[PDB]
Amino acid sequence: ASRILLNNGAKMPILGLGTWKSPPGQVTEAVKVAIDVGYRHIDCAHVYQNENEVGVAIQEKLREQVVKREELFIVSKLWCTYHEKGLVKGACQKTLSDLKLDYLDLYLIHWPTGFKPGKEFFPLDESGNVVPSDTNILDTWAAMEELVDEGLVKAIGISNFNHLQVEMILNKPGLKYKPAVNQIECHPYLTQEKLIQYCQSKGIVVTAYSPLGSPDRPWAKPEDPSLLEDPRIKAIAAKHNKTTAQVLIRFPMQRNLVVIPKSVTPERIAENFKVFDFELSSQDMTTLLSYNRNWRVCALLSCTSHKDYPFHEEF
Ligand SMILES: NC(=O)c1ccc[n+]([C@@H]2O[C@H](COP(=O)([O-])OP(=O)(O)OC[C@H]3O[C@@H](n4cnc5c(N)ncnc54)[C@H](OP(=O)(O)O)[C@@H]3O)[C@@H](O)[C@H]2O)c1
Ligand SMILES: O=C(O)Cc1nn(Cc2nc3cc(C(F)(F)F)ccc3s2)c(=O)c2ccccc12
C-alpha cells in the first residue's frame, strides 16, 4: 500500500518530499513538480524558513484542482523555542498561515529539547552552549493535545525522541492522545533497529529522515561516510537497474517506515517517486542493515549539554 494507517485513524503516504535546505526561491516550483508527479505528503518546519513558499505551491495546486485538500498530507513541526504552553498555539497558527492551510495533518514536537524563547532559533550563551527553557516534554505534549481538540491538527507526534522519551510520553499521567509518529534519522549507516521496533510495537509509525545521508547538510566533511557513493549500495542498485537513491528510499519503505527524501531538482523529485515498482530482497535488506555504523547527520554539538539531549543513550 502507498499509505500507512496511523493510530488516529488516518492514512499517511509512505513517501513524502522533504524541504529542509530547499532554497525559498526554488521550493515553490519543487513542491509544484512533486504534486504533479504524485507526491501527496510534504514535510515542513517553521525552522526551515521556507513555509511561506511551500505554501504558495500547495495553494496553487489546490486552486488549479490538481489535488483535493483531503488527498494531501502536510506535516510541520514545533521548533524548540516554542515549547512553553502559551507559545504552542501561536506557533502552530503561524505555520498554518504560512502554509495557507486551515489544518495540519500531522504536527510534531521537532526535538525533545526546549530552548529559551526569543527571535533566535538557537539562542546561545557567551560560550556557545544552547540556552534551555525550563519546560518538559510532558507539558509540551499536553499543549500539542490541545491543538487536536481545537481542530488545528489532525494528528500529533514527536521527532528525535529516544526510547526513554517515547516511553515517558506513553506513560504520561492523564495522557489523552498517543503520539502518531516518531520522526527520526534513519539510513543504512544509522539503522535504528531498537528504537524502531519499540515504536512499532507501540503502534507509533516511524518516519525516516535524511534517507540519502543529507549530502547538502552545511557541516559536511571530507572524511564523512557517503551513502550515495557507497560501492556496496551502488552494486545493489545496479542489480535492480535502479539508482542508488531509489534503493536508499525503498529500503525504509520495506521496514514499514515513512520516508521523506528532499530535493529541489525536478528530475530527482521524479526519480525519487519511482520506487513503487520494485522490491529489495530480504537478503538485500539485511545486507543494507549490516552497514550500520551509528553515524548521525543531525546532532548539533552546542545542544549536547541540554538535560533532554536525546543521543547520549544507545537509542
Ligand atoms: N525531524 C528533524 O529533525 C529532521 C532533520 C533532518 C531532516 N528532516 C526532514 O527530512 C528531509 C530529508 O532529509 P535531508 O534534507 O537531511 O537529506 P536527504 O533527503 O537525505 O538528502 C537531500 C540531499 O540529497 C540530494 N538528492 C535528492 N535526491 C537525489 C537523487 N535522486 N540523487 C542524488 N542526490 C539526490 C539533494 O540534492 P538536490 O536537492 O540538490 O536535488 C540534497 O542535497 C528534510 O529535508 C526534512 O524535511 C527532519
Ligand atoms: O531540525 C532539523 O529538522 C534539521 C536541522 N538539524 N540541525 C542539526 C540539529 N541538531 C539538534 C539537536 C538537538 C538536541 F535535541 F539534540 F538537543 C536539538 C536541535 C537540533 S538541530 C540544525 O542545526 C538545523 C538548523 C536549522 C534548520 C534545521 C536544522
CATH number at residue 85: 3.20.20.100
Contact 58, 100 (CB under 8 A): yes
In angstroms, the CA 30 to CA 217 distance is 18
**Amino acid residing at 253:** M
User: Which ligand 1 atom minimizes the distance to the CA of 22?
Assistant: 39
In angstroms, the CA 62 to CA 69 distance is 7
Q: Is 135 annotated as a binding residue?
A: no
Q: How far out from the chain centre does Cα 21 lie?
A: 13
Q: Which three cell numbers stand for residue 82?
A: 516554542
Backbone angles phi, psi at 247, to 5 degrees: -65, -45
Contact 75, 138 (CB under 8 A): no
Residue with the smallest CA separation from ligand 2 atom 21 is: 300
In angstroms, the CA 269 to CA 62 distance is 20
Q: Is 293 annotated as a binding residue?
A: no
In angstroms, the CA 154 to CA 106 distance is 6
Domain range enclosing 180: 1-315
Residue for grid cell 499536553: 142
State the total domains in the chain. 1
Q: How far out from the chain centre does Cα 45 lie?
A: 9
Chain breaks in the chain (C to N over 2.5 A) after: none
Backbone angles phi, psi at 104, to 5 degrees: -100, 150
The data reach a resolution, in angstroms, of 1.6
Q: 48, 177, 198, 209: which one is catalytic?
A: 48
Residue from 44, 300, 312 to probe ligand 2 pocket by mutation (most atoms less than 8 Å from CB): 300
Query: E strands, the chain, where?
Result: 3-5, 11-13, 17-18, 41-43, 73-78, 106-109, 156-159, 181-185, 205-209, 258-259
Pocket lining for ligand 1, CB < 6 angstroms: 18-21, 43, 110, 159-160, 183, 209-216, 228, 243, 245, 260-265, 268, 271-272, 297-298
Q: How far out from the chain centre does Cα 268 lie?
A: 19
In angstroms, the CA 66 to CA 32 distance is 10
User: Which ligand 2 atom minimizes the distance to the CA of 130?
Assistant: 17
Closest among 134, 199, 209 to 167, alpha carbons compared? 199
CA–centroid distance, 303 to ligand 2, in Å, is 9
- Give the CA diameter of the chain: 54
Element (H, E) at 55: helix 51-63
- Which residues have a Cβ under 8 Å from the Cβ of 68 and sit 6 or more positions away? 62
Contact 107, 155 (CB under 8 A): yes
Q: Is 112 annotated as a binding residue?
A: no
The residues facing 76 across adjacent strands are: 107
Q: Is 252 annotated as a binding residue?
A: yes
> Does residue 48 have an active-site annotation?
yes
Three-state secondary structure along 239-265? Answer: HHCCCHHHHHHHHHHCCCCEECCECCC
